[PDB]
Design a protein around this ligand. Structure first.
Ligand SMILES: *[C@@H]1O[C@H](CO)[C@@H](O[C@@H]2O[C@H](CO)[C@@H](O[C@@H]3O[C@H](CO)[C@@H](O)[C@H](O[C@H]4O[C@H](CO)[C@@H](O)[C@H](O)[C@@H]4O)[C@@H]3O)[C@H](O)[C@H]2NC(C)=O)[C@H](O)[C@H]1NC(C)=O
Ligand SMILES: *[C@@H]1O[C@H](CO)[C@@H](O[C@@H]2O[C@H](CO)[C@@H](O)[C@H](O)[C@H]2NC(C)=O)[C@H](O)[C@H]1NC(C)=O
Ligand SMILES: *[C@@H]1O[C@H](CO)[C@@H](O)[C@H](O)[C@H]1NC(C)=O
Lengths: 47, 500
């Protein structure tokens, strides 16, 4: 009852990740691959 | 000697699975005491030990606590949030939806030491299992200039919370026990106090520079500093290097003088920073002003007319929320020699971004950067024309000063490119920070370079890994030229050689 899938409009929003809709805030966000950071998963992380 | 960490700005985004996320979070904030950025506690699953949080005592930016199904978050010793940065442009503390879908989750948030929010408001929402937090009177902690922006809808559905110990003034407490009661340092203060205080007595009126409170009215007896921290004394502004003489009308030397660096007064700026005439350590000089060394000191000087163009980097100025060098902002680097800041080249520059209204970038448009000889921050290259074999646009780059560093660590990062050679044949100095050369499946000459010859600081390390293997490159004859034996090279050709 917390996160949900994102819309089809959200395709290349997450650069290295999967979009997630947060229903308590009504906001869209990302879940990055391992080793990637940033709100949009844009930067390679040190480890 | 205060333990220090960078913080995170991921803002509710998840790094990998809940395990990976917890591991990154714990690696970040392990034995940290002062967080220079934001403190973001998100997505921590039940039965996960958050013991390291017990060390953080100060946060410069904002504190976010969201979507944790852990039962307890022991930010016991968090004293101050300076609010140098807001969550959603009005919050220095945002605790939001800490629960699992089976109606359980965060309950214990014993921030017994949080006594000051310099800037910003706080917002609480959708914390069902959260215990005891509807008790805290925030008029004491938050500044009066932010009281209207609070939006904090304290309700709970669990209700199985132990009432605040009868010893707590006004029933306000952070957790259970007589130890979690709220300490007032502003509301209970006397009328004659300047600001913070220990009690309603005029004796306990704390110095105006004491942010959280004090253990004595002197400058050096503060709990946290409001403005600057000179040694063990809270100062409104750093002591200048020279003081005026009201009698002689001239400037005299100040023996207790100090240089302004960050929120501290230091005896000397760091090696790669600039120094203004005001005696302050700066990261860049204003427009119509240039950098120069003169007697062992890097310093700013004005120019009466002919001086270099002000080229800010990706991140600052007109490039405020930009992720990369892209088709929109490439033109603004036409005649740049020094980059005042950082450079990012990400894959989306090449693919184009629909969400920032950014078309794709022509690889041939990259050669604009060939004029650049100095970068003052870090250089991060995660994308490059796949048809290009080396980093041709940076063949005339000489110095990366590394004032600002990626994650506070890396001043040169070249990751996941199709290149075969680095081709950085004018490179001569990397003044600070680490190098990381990773994932470039075809790169073959990075091993030949003695990178410790470019470094301007002990402990500068490299991370040269997961490229084309050494023995791979040697097997295909992809090695430095014979005439170039001493320090290796940046490519197969004799000019790519460092010493020839
Ligand atoms: C390619 O380069 C261009 C040029 O640098 C770059 O365009 C810039 O994009 C950012 C982000 O879209 C723009 O910054 C915005 O400015 C407006 C005010 O005009 C703000 O409202 C924006 O968001 C704010 O509010 C949000 C509320 O949720 C906050 O979350 C957020 O943090 C902000 O506070 C944002 O600041 C910028 O104006 C443009 N500039 C130009 C010249 O177009 C583009 O982003 C680059 N491409 C990529 C992929 O980054
Ligand atoms: C947070 O406080 C500010 C400052 O009092 C208020 O914002 C108002 O609107 C704009 C946007 O910040 C300001 O320029 C105004 O000066 C503010 N006051 C008025 C009367 O318009 C507002 O109280 C809060 N902002 C939000 C977005 O809730
Ligand atoms: C990457 O480099 C190799 C080097 O020969 C080349 O064969 C390959 O086509 C390059 N990839 C692209 C997409 O150009």
């Amino acid at each position: 009852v917390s996160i949900t899938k994102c819309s089809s409009d959200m395709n290349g929003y997450c650069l290295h990740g999967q979009c997630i809709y947060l229903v308590d805030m009504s906001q869209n966000y990302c879940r990055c691959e391992v080793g990637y950071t940033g709100v949009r998963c844009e930067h390679f992380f040190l480890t | 000697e205060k333990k220090v960490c960078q913080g995170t700005s991921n803002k509710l985004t998840q790094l990998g699975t809940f395990e990976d996320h917890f591991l990154s979070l714990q690696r970040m904030f392990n034995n940290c005491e002062v967080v220079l950025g934001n403190l973001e506690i998100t997505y921590v699953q039940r039965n996960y030990d958050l013991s390291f949080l017990k060390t953080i005592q100060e946060v410069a930016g904002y504190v976010l606590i969201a979507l944790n199904t852990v039962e307890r978050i022991p930010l016991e010793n968090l004293q101050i949030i300076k609010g140098n940065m807001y969550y959603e442009n009005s919050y220095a503390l945002a605790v939001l939806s800490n629960y699992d879908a089976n109606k359980t989750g965060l309950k214990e948030l014993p921030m017994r030491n949080l006594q000051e929010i310099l800037h910003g408001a706080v917002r609480f929402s959708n914390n069902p299992a959260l215990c005891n937090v509807e008790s805290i009177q925030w008029r004491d902690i938050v500044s009066s200039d932010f009281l209207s922006n609070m939006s904090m809808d304290f309700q709970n559905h669990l209700g199985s919370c132990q009432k605040c110990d009868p010893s707590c003034p006004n029933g306000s407490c952070w957790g259970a026990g007589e130890e979690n009661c709220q300490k007032l340092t502003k509301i209970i203060c006397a009328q004659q106090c300047s600001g913070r205080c220990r009690g309603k007595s005029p004796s306990d009126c704390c110095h105006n520079q004491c942010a959280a409170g004090c253990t004595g009215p002197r400058e050096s007896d503060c709990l946290v500093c409001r403005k600057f921290r000179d040694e063990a004394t809270c100062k409104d502004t750093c002591p200048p290097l020279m003081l005026y003489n009201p009698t002689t009308y001239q400037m005299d030397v100040n023996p207790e003088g100090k240089y302004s660096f960050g929120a501290t007064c230091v005896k000397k700026c760091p090696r790669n920073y600039v120094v203004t005439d005001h005696g302050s350590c700066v990261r860049a000089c204003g427009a119509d002003s240039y950098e120069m060394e003169e007697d062992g000191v890097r310093k700013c000087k004005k120019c009466e007319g002919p001086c270099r163009k002000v080229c800010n980097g990706i991140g600052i100025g007109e490039f405020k929320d930009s992720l990369s060098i892209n088709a929109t902002n490439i033109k603004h680097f036409k005649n740049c020699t020094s980059i005042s800041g950082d450079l990012h080249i990400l894959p989306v520059a090449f693919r184009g971004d629909s969400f920032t209204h950014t078309p794709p970038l022509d690889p041939q448009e990259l050669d604009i950067l060939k004029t650049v000889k100095e970068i003052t921050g870090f250089l991060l290259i995660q994308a490059w024309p796949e048809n290009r074999t080396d980093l041709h646009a940076f063949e005339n780059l000489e110095i990366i000063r590394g004032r600002t560093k990626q994650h506070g660590q890396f001043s040169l990062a070249v990751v996941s490119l199709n290149i075969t050679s680095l081709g950085l044949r004018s490179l001569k100095e990397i003044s600070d920070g680490d190098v990381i050369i990773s994932g470039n499946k075809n790169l073959c000459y990075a091993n030949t370079i003695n990178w410790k010859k470019l470094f301007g600081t002990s402990g500068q390390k490299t991370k040269i890994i997961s490229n084309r293997g050494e023995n791979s490159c040697k097997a295909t004859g992809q090695v430095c030229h014979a005439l170039c034996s001493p320090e290796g090279c940046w490519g197969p050709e004799p000019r790519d050689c460092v010493s020839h």
